[PDB]
Design an enzyme around this catalytic site. Structure first.
Site, PDB file in Angstrom:
ATOM      1  N   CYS A 164      10.928  16.851  50.760  1.00 19.04           N
ATOM      2  CA  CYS A 164      10.342  15.280  52.027  1.00 19.04           C
ATOM      3  C   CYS A 164       9.948  15.696  52.758  1.00 19.04           C
ATOM      4  O   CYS A 164      10.174  16.257  53.748  1.00 19.04           O
ATOM      5  CB  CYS A 164      11.525  14.887  52.077  1.00 19.04           C
ATOM      6  SG  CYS A 164      13.316  15.084  50.301  1.00 19.04           S
ATOM      7  N   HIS A 182      19.910  21.830  53.012  1.00 13.60           N
ATOM      8  CA  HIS A 182      19.068  22.669  51.794  1.00 13.60           C
ATOM      9  C   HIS A 182      19.322  22.359  50.539  1.00 13.60           C
ATOM     10  O   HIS A 182      18.457  22.948  49.634  1.00 13.60           O
ATOM     11  CB  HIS A 182      18.412  23.868  52.405  1.00 13.60           C
ATOM     12  CG  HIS A 182      17.821  23.825  53.782  1.00 13.60           C
ATOM     13  ND1 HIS A 182      16.417  23.376  53.916  1.00 13.60           N
ATOM     14  CD2 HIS A 182      17.806  24.873  55.000  1.00 13.60           C
ATOM     15  CE1 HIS A 182      16.165  23.831  55.183  1.00 13.60           C
ATOM     16  NE2 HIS A 182      17.162  23.704  55.781  1.00 13.60           N
ATOM     17  N   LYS A 237      13.527  13.352  60.202  1.00 11.27           N
ATOM     18  CA  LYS A 237      12.772  14.795  60.710  1.00 11.27           C
ATOM     19  C   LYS A 237      11.416  14.254  59.576  1.00 11.27           C
ATOM     20  O   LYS A 237      11.211  14.287  58.525  1.00 11.27           O
ATOM     21  CB  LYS A 237      14.135  15.464  59.688  1.00 11.27           C
ATOM     22  CG  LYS A 237      13.827  17.191  60.093  1.00 11.27           C
ATOM     23  CD  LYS A 237      15.373  17.956  59.527  1.00 11.27           C
ATOM     24  CE  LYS A 237      14.798  19.465  58.928  1.00 11.27           C
ATOM     25  NZ  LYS A 237      13.869  19.862  59.876  1.00 11.27           N
ATOM     26  N   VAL A 283      11.308  31.500  46.553  1.00 12.50           N
ATOM     27  CA  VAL A 283      12.519  30.151  47.854  1.00 12.50           C
ATOM     28  C   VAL A 283      11.911  31.886  49.469  1.00 12.50           C
ATOM     29  O   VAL A 283      12.561  32.549  49.235  1.00 12.50           O
ATOM     30  CB  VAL A 283      13.225  30.393  47.980  1.00 12.50           C
ATOM     31  CG1 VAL A 283      12.628  28.172  47.985  1.00 12.50           C
ATOM     32  CG2 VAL A 283      14.305  30.377  47.015  1.00 12.50           C
ATOM     33  N   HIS A 323      19.579  30.047  57.188  1.00 11.18           N
ATOM     34  CA  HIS A 323      17.833  29.396  57.280  1.00 11.18           C
ATOM     35  C   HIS A 323      16.969  29.895  56.055  1.00 11.18           C
ATOM     36  O   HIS A 323      16.894  30.290  55.629  1.00 11.18           O
ATOM     37  CB  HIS A 323      17.245  29.832  58.765  1.00 11.18           C
ATOM     38  CG  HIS A 323      18.153  29.916  59.818  1.00 11.18           C
ATOM     39  ND1 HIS A 323      18.258  28.778  60.357  1.00 11.18           N
ATOM     40  CD2 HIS A 323      18.834  30.650  60.489  1.00 11.18           C
ATOM     41  CE1 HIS A 323      19.169  28.971  61.392  1.00 11.18           C
ATOM     42  NE2 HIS A 323      19.564  30.815  61.444  1.00 11.18           N
TER      43      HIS A 323
END
EC number: 3.1.27.-
Length: 123
Positions: free
Chosen positions: A83, A13, A40, A105, A116
Site C-alpha cells: 500500500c 505486516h 504511513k 520476503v 522487522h
C-alpha cells in the site's frame, strides 16, 4: 519474556486472509492497524500461514539494507500486498494505491522470530 516486537511485526505486516487486494483494501487495513495517523508512506502485508513466516528465520542469512547482519530471505514466494500513499500529505484521509504480488520476503529476526520487514524491497 517480552514478545512485543514479534507481535508488533504481525500487527504491521500480517494479514492471513485479506478481504481484497485493491485500494479499498489498503485504505481499510491501514486504518484498522493504526498506520493512518500520520499517514504511513508505504507498507506491505504478507498473507498466508503464520508458521510459514516464522520459518524464514531458519533460512538463508543475508545482510539487511541498513547494515545489520541479522536478515533472512525466504526460500519460497509469498502473496503480498503493498500500500503506497497517494499524494504526500501526512494528514488523513489517507489514500492508498495497492500493488499485489507474489515474491520472496526479507525479514530481520531476533531469537528465531521475525521482528522487522526489510521494506526497502517493496518501494
Amino acid at each position: 519474556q517480552d514478545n512485543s516486537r514479534y507481535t508488533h511485526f504481525l500487527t504491521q505486516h500480517y494479514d492471513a486472509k485479506p478481504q481484497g487486494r485493491d485500494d479499498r483494501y489498503c485504505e481499510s487495513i491501514m486504518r484498522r492497524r493504526g498506520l493512518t495517523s500520520p499517514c504511513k508512506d508505504i507498507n506491505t502485508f504478507i498473507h498466508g500461514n503464520k508458521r510459514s513466516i516464522k520459518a524464514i528465520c531458519s533460512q538463508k542469512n543475508v545482510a539487511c539494507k541498513n547494515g545489520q547482519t541479522n536478515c533472512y530471505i525466504s526460500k519460497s514466494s509469498f502473496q503480498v500486498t503493498t500500500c503506497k500513499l497517494h499524494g504526500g500529505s501526512p494528514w488523513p484521509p489517507c489514500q492508498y494505491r495497492a500493488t499485489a504480488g507474489f515474491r520472496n520476503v526479507v525479514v530481520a529476526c531476533e531469537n528465531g522470530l521475525p521482528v522487522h520487514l526489510d521494506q526497502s524491497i517493496f518501494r
